[PDB]
Every structure is written in C-alpha cells, then in structure tokens.
Design an enzyme around this catalytic site. Structure first.
Site, PDB file in Angstrom:
ATOM      1  N   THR A  41      -3.403   6.973 -22.058  1.00 13.70           N
ATOM      2  CA  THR A  41      -3.481   5.639 -21.513  1.00 13.70           C
ATOM      3  C   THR A  41      -2.044   5.169 -21.676  1.00 13.70           C
ATOM      4  OG1 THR A  41      -4.124   4.943 -23.749  1.00 13.70           O
ATOM      5  CG2 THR A  41      -5.856   4.981 -22.126  1.00 13.70           C
ATOM      6  N   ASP A  48      -6.053  14.834 -24.928  1.00 10.11           N
ATOM      7  CA  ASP A  48      -6.149  13.416 -24.589  1.00 10.11           C
ATOM      8  C   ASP A  48      -5.526  12.668 -25.767  1.00 10.11           C
ATOM      9  OD1 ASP A  48      -6.873  10.763 -24.163  1.00 10.11           O
ATOM     10  OD2 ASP A  48      -8.933  11.227 -23.611  1.00 10.11           O
ATOM     11  N   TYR A  55       0.905  -1.129   0.000  1.00 14.20           N
ATOM     12  CA  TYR A  55       0.000   0.000   0.000  1.00 14.20           C
ATOM     13  C   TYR A  55       0.955   1.192   0.000  1.00 14.20           C
ATOM     14  CZ  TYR A  55      -4.996  -0.187   0.139  1.00 14.20           C
ATOM     15  OH  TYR A  55      -6.302  -0.257  -0.256  1.00 14.20           O
ATOM     16  N   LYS A 104      -2.528   0.764 -25.729  1.00 10.58           N
ATOM     17  CA  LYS A 104      -2.891   1.243 -27.095  1.00 10.58           C
ATOM     18  C   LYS A 104      -1.573   1.439 -27.920  1.00 10.58           C
ATOM     19  CE  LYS A 104      -7.531   3.127 -25.814  1.00 10.58           C
ATOM     20  NZ  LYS A 104      -8.053   4.430 -25.400  1.00 10.58           N
ATOM     21  N   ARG A 158      -2.362  -1.714 -19.174  1.00  6.30           N
ATOM     22  CA  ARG A 158      -3.573  -0.914 -19.074  1.00  6.30           C
ATOM     23  C   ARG A 158      -3.480   0.026 -17.873  1.00  6.30           C
ATOM     24  NH1 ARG A 158      -7.797  -2.063 -22.378  1.00  6.30           N
ATOM     25  NH2 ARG A 158      -6.978  -3.750 -23.712  1.00  6.30           N
ATOM     26  N   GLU A 176      -0.142   4.857  -0.737  1.00  2.00           N
ATOM     27  CA  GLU A 176      -0.843   6.113  -0.943  1.00  2.00           C
ATOM     28  C   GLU A 176       0.152   7.248  -0.722  1.00  2.00           C
ATOM     29  OE1 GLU A 176      -4.026   5.738   1.876  1.00  2.00           O
ATOM     30  OE2 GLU A 176      -5.458   5.068   0.350  1.00  2.00           O
TER      31      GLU A 176
END
Lengths: 402, 402
Positions: B218, B192, B46, B221, B227, B48
């Site tokens: 992204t 984008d 974890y 692609k 992803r 954060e």
C-alpha cells in the site's frame, strides 16, 4: 522539504488544461470544493465496513459523511439503496458481476467496436476472462441498436446478465425493452450509466433505475464529481448482496476523502444550476456535430441525443490515431475511437470521439461551436501549425476554469 | 453554493483526529503536500495506458508525473520495475494473483486468525472465492511462524503462489527461506509488505525485493503516503505481464492525482529525515510494549521487531472487545486481535494490536511511552471517565498534526 519538482509538473498540467480545448467525452473539470474534500484529512482513517458496522472504532464522523453520500445519491437518482465505496467504475462493475454470476456464466454486453466499454466483455479485461461473452452491436445502415437482434441473441445464448449502457453510443436507450428481453430469459439487467449519469440526474436522459436490477456508474464524467465509482438499485435485498462483494469481497479500506467529494458532487448535481449546465452540454454537442457535418464530416448515426458523438474519418483518408495526434498538436484533445464495423484495428481506428461536458463547464455556448468546428477542421486538413495553436490558446484562455 | 453540511463534518473529523491518540497500526497522518497533490486538478485527466502509450491525447505532463513516481519507487526500494496505478493494496494483490494464476489454482497464505490479511485467502474475499486456499499460521509454543510447517504444507499441496507478509505479525520474516520453499515446489513467491513497507524503505526491515518474484504494498500505513497500491519486482518481464492485468485487466482510468501524491510520499521517504522517523517508530513500539509488560500485560512473542505488537489481556481478565470499547471511550483507538490459539471466539478475542506509526508522526518519543502506557492501563482497569478523557485530549493536543 517541499517536493518542488513534483509541484512544478502540477503547475504545467493546470496550464495545459487552461490553454487547451479538452474534447474527450469522458473528461470534465471538478469544482474547487470537490477538490477541497478530496484533499482532506479523511484519508487518515481506515473505515473498513459500512456505517454503523465498521471493523474499527473512531468512525462516528466518517459514518455520517458516507451516509450523507449514500442518501444524496438515492435522492438524486430515486434509488432505494446505494454503495459509494467503489474505487472506480471498473470496481463497481466487477462487484456486480461477481455478486450475480459465477465464473463460466454467460454475460451479454455491447461490442467494443459498436461502442461498448472494456468491462462489457473484452477478452483482455476481467469481464471476458472470467465469463463467456456474447456481444450485440448496431445495424450497418442506421448505426442504431436493433432490439430484435438483442432479443434473438438473448434467446439463443440465455445470458445470466445483460449489460446496457456504453462509452461511445450517441443515442438514447430503451431500458424498458431491455428489461423485457432480460425477463424473457430470466437474466439480470445491469445498466452501466457512467457516461450519461449526469444527464439522468438532470432529467435529460431516460432513467434506468425503475427497469434495471442494478445500475453502476462513475462519479466523474457527466456527473462532474471526483474520480470513483457508484452502485444503485431499487432492490435493497440485492443491494445487501452487492455490499458484501465490495467489502470484504473485492476491496479493502474505502477512500473516505473521495467519498466526501462524491457527497459534495451529489450536492452540486441537486442544484437547479446543474440542470442548466447539462442542457447546454447537449445543445453544445448537437450544434458541434452539426457544424462539423456542414463541413463534410460524417457523424455516426447522423447526430446525437447526448454529450458525445463519433466522426467517421474514412472518407477523408485519416486514421483515428492520426486525427488525435494532429489535434493534440494544436491543443485540442480527443481520443481515436473505433466506429461501428471499423475496418482498421483498435490501435489505429478510423474515427475520433468528441464530447462537450468539459468545455461547457468552462462556459462555452452553442454560438461558439462554429468556431470550435473551424479549428478542428483546419487541424485535420492543413495539419499542425504555430498560428493555429495560438488561435486555440486564445479561445481557451478566454474561458475560465473552475 | 458551498456544501456547508459536508464541510462541517470534515471540521469535526479534524478535531477528532487532533484530540485523540491513534494506536491502530495501519494508520498514519499524511503531510500537507501529499494532500495538496491528491486534491490537485490531475483528477480531471483520463490516462488509461502507461507513459508513452496512452489511450487518449494530452497526457504529456501526466506521463512525467507517473514516470517520476515509478523511478522514485525503484530508487527507494531497489527495484527494476514498478507499477504505481493500483487503486489500493487489494487491487495490487488482485492484479498479481490474476497474472500468475488461473481460477481453481492453489494459493498459500497466512491464516487470518494468525495475522494474515483478507486478501491472503479469506473465503469471503475474492482470494478464497477464485482460488483453493491452504493456510499457515503460528506455533502455539513459539507464537512464531514455523518454516518446517510451511514447507510440509507446500510439498503436500503444491500451491502455485505462496504469499509472505501479514497484517498482524510482530517479527521479521525470513524471505530467503520462503523463496527456497517456493523454488522446491515450483511456486511463485509474493511478498505483501503493505504494513512494513516504510521500514523496508528506511532499511530497518529485511528487503524482500531480491527473494520474491513480486512485491505488493500500500502507499499509506508505515510508508506514510496517500491511500493506494504499489507493485515492485526485480523482473521486468514479469512486470510487463502484471502491467497488462492492472490495465486493461482489472482497472480503467488511473487516479493520477493520487499517483502525484505517491511520488511526493516517495520523495519524503528518500530524505534522511524519514529514516529517523522510522527508527523512532520502532523504538516507540518496543518501549511501549515494555512499559505495558511492566504493568502486568504479556506481549505475544515477548516483544516486537517492527511498528506493531499484540497484547495478551488474559493476565488482567479482559477480552479484546471490552478493551477496545473502554479505550475508545477515552479517545484511544486500538483494535481487538486474536492471540495464538485464542481461547475466545474471533469476535471477542483475548488481545489487542497496537501500533506507533501515527503517534510518532505526531512527535511522540520513547520517553513519553511510559505515560501512554499508564493511560491505557487506567482506562482498562478504571474504565472510562471524563477526567481520563480530558487527560488524553490534552496530551494529544500538545503533539501537533502535520
């Protein structure tokens, strides 16, 4: 060319995990097969939509993978509907909120200081920015939740949604009572069981499914699955609504490789061995809290009914931040955590949160808790030292990793 | 106990992937090393926060992984700031919108029917639910964007944010013109580049970095990574604001195993071999479009400047839906796509979108496009047959996967 630099860092992280005692309550160690599914070629397919109803073709096999994850989750928690596409517990909560409320509506959640999660109404989170938040905490004496105070706030403020569940509350929840309260004001009861989802699956924690309108959770943490989200409900009509908020509402393509990992994790949780593991998690937590209390440490609420507990470090003149740094120095990782009615700001805090899911996976047993308690105590009183770091290393190395 | 049922499906999906021709423009095949990183133990941590400022202990190695992904992203795209934590392209867009706008503000994006993405203003998406939307499209006569139309709309509606980029636009974008229009009305320009990010990295497509206030993408692609999402900018001050919206704003714990995979993908993109792959992607698209035109189809805009192109099926009396099914039956996956001012409803359409990034990764070269063009044409005119399915399978198998 192989990215040698990157893989060397991954090797360093495996070593750190192996040579340390991970006591952060929200962490765990996933199995090798969970990793195999997550690192699969399923990542090469855009499967926007849902099984049997995708935007694109070529999903005949993916549909079966997602469906299996869906049916297993239903069978595991006794739910009539499930959505396994949320990228995280945060996206799970985000979708539920947006499906049940409009911006400006009143949301009621547990106060961050009393143990609530960032997604339960914090001003710096989307929860507190889009919605009007009302918070309930715990009593100053017992440090437990007072249901009459919750009822009072609900009647006074009339929230559209009431959230039960938290990231740092060590006791059981009375979901039946929370639903009664929600019914008195015509609100939806949303239970975020991310933390104790694994204990519910094992039958060691009251199941929220029959009382809550909607239940959200992470697939990681006590459930010991891949990092991701999940949503359940005994109402399939409400479920259809929420499916729309996950997609096309707040996400685009799902992470099908991760979803395959969720299926595997649900498969593991359905095995008798998972119940035995969960029982040990709780036994380890109680016993560790007990051994620390015997050493003069104050345990919030005096103990725990679950996998975690909070230690109040005010009496020892240590801030949560300091404790975390001293322990981290010797290979013991925890996280500073605000305690109920904490005098210090959140960036410093007066306590630390400890959990046992991770070390229980590594085979630690209640009989070893006294040793873990000794190392924590020494690290806080005497501070970091090489010899202490070594003692931690040997202990950890004596337990294998999945 | 191994989850046999789940692993049997994964093996079926791999086969499906090997034996078919993937022509969906947003698809690609990641390398083995990208998958190795994604399936690593980094999922257990974890983390954060951001490097050097985390909400948990034990992040010393994780910080090196994340910094490495950030620095490689900056060097690859020519940026001053980067955020590698977005779970997907959608969350990247969400964080930016929430950092720049308040609910009720006006967003200007490309109409979905003209090529825009769901996150550019669709009413069923968070973009069209939280904000007021004004859309721009393409001209019926040029089949291209009209900068005068965009300007008029911007002056008339005064959007707070204008988004450039799309999911089905086969020509270059004039980013300078967009920034001029944005400055004229005091709006932020968001680009984008998810679809064409790989080409930008290879220097085969104009780079939006100097003209946009913020750039989202992204990692999968054309960039051929795992992803997930990404955010870049030439303005560190704006970056800091956006970092807060990702966390604690809309996400919780980041997927550090995916961030490791992103770092790997950036490393692959920094190699000269990636520039050659991308050059081939574009030559394959152009050549395939020509071969199809030669066989009686019309190419929207008459061709393409990137990795994708739209086929107008009207000359042969087909709809995109029919073409989609006929092609899917012989192992060729494409997706229907409306053509400019399509005489058919959106669920039917008169065209299809085709992209070469995936087959190129599989070793297809421009000299083979004529063959691919013939198979597509036979499938559409003769319809599905076992003999045609076998010919596709063999061609596919003769071109290995990474």
């Amino acid at each position: 060319k192989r990215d040698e630099a990157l893989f060397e860092l991954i090797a360093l992280e495996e070593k750190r995990q192996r040579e340390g005692l991970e006591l952060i309550a929200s962490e765990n160690f996933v199995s090798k097969q969970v990793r195999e599914a997550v690192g699969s070629v399923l990542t090469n397919k855009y499967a926007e939509g849902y099984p049997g109803a995708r935007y694109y073709g070529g999903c005949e096999v993916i549909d079966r993978v997602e469906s299996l994850a869906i049916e297993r989750a239903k069978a595991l928690f006794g739910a009539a509907w499930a959505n396994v596409q949320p990228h995280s517990g945060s996206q799970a909560n985000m979708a539920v909120y947006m499906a049940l409320m409009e911006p400006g509506d009143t949301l009621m959640g547990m106060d961050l200081a009393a143990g609530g999660h960032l997604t339960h109404g914090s001003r710096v989170n989307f929860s507190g920015k889009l919605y009007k938040v009302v918070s309930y905490g715990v009593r100053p004496d017992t440090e437990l939740i007072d249901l009459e105070e919750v009822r009072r706030l609900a009647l006074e403020h009339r929230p559209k949604v009431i959230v039960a569940g938290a990231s740092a509350y060590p006791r059981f929840w009375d979901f039946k009572a929370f639903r009664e309260i929600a019914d008195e004001v015509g609100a939806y009861l949303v239970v975020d069981m991310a933390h104790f989802a694994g204990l519910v699956a094992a039958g060691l924690h009251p199941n929220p499914l029959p009382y809550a309108h909607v239940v959200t959770s992470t697939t990681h943490k006590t459930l010991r699955g891949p990092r991701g989200g999940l949503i359940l409900s005994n109402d399939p009509e409400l479920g259809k609504r929420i499916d729309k908020l996950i997609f096309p509402g707040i996400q685009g393509g799902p992470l099908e490789h991760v979803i395959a990992g969720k299926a595997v994790a649900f498969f593991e949780a359905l095995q008798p061995e998972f119940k035995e593991y969960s029982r040990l998690v709780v036994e380890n937590a109680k016993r560790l809290a007990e051994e620390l209390a015997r050493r003069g440490y104050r345990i919030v609420t005096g103990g725990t009914d679950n996998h975690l507990f909070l230690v109040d470090l005010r009496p020892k003149g240590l801030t949560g931040k300091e404790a975390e740094e001293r322990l981290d120095a010797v290979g013991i990782t925890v996280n500073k955590n605000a305690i109920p009615f904490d005098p210090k700001p959140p960036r410093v805090t007066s306590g630390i949160r400890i959990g046992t899911p991770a070390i229980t996976t590594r085979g630690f047993t209640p009989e070893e808790m006294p040793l873990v308690a000794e190392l924590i105590d020494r690290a806080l009183l005497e501070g970091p030292s090489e010899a202490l770091r070594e003692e931690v290393r040997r202990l950890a190395l004596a337990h294998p990793m999945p």
